Design brief:
It is classed as virus like particle. The entry lists the keywords encapsulin, virus like particle, protein nanocompartment. Acinetobacter baumannii 118362 family 2A cargo-loaded encapsulin shell. The structure is cut from a larger assembly and holds two copies of chain A. Helix content of chain A is 0%, strand content 25%. By secondary structure, chain A is mainly β. Chain A has a two-stranded antiparallel ribbon with strand order 1-2.
Chain lengths: 51, 52
């Protein structure tokens, strides 16, 4: 990450440039797996019998 | 050489408020052809007799 001064405009406003450089690499295919179609809105109805 | 400023009324400054208003641009100008002062001489020749 880097921060650089760019200058002051005629409205007396100073500008700063912020930049972050990055990337991602997967060296072998078997290092990553994904499970799809996961449903998160289902709740179980359990029978109850109270004293 | 006596240099001088010749745009006294064109040097613009602004009184600022609590806002993001634009600011004036300005510069100071000099007289293109200033007066140059040159020394004058008061001189005389004095004669003295060698015998005296």
């Amino acid at each position: 990450l880097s921060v650089r001064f760019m200058g002051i405009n005629r409205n007396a406003i100073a500008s700063y440039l912020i930049s972050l450089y990055c990337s991602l690499a997967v060296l072998t295919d078997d290092a990553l797996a994904v499970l799809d179609d996961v449903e998160v809105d289902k709740y179980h109805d359990y029978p109850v019998n109270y004293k | 050489r006596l240099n001088r400023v010749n745009n006294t009324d064109d040097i613009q400054v602004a009184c600022t408020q609590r806002d993001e208003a634009t600011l004036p641009q300005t510069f100071v100008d000099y007289a293109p052809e200033p007066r140059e002062y040159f020394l004058n001489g008061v001189s005389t020749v004095l004669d003295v007799h060698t015998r005296v």
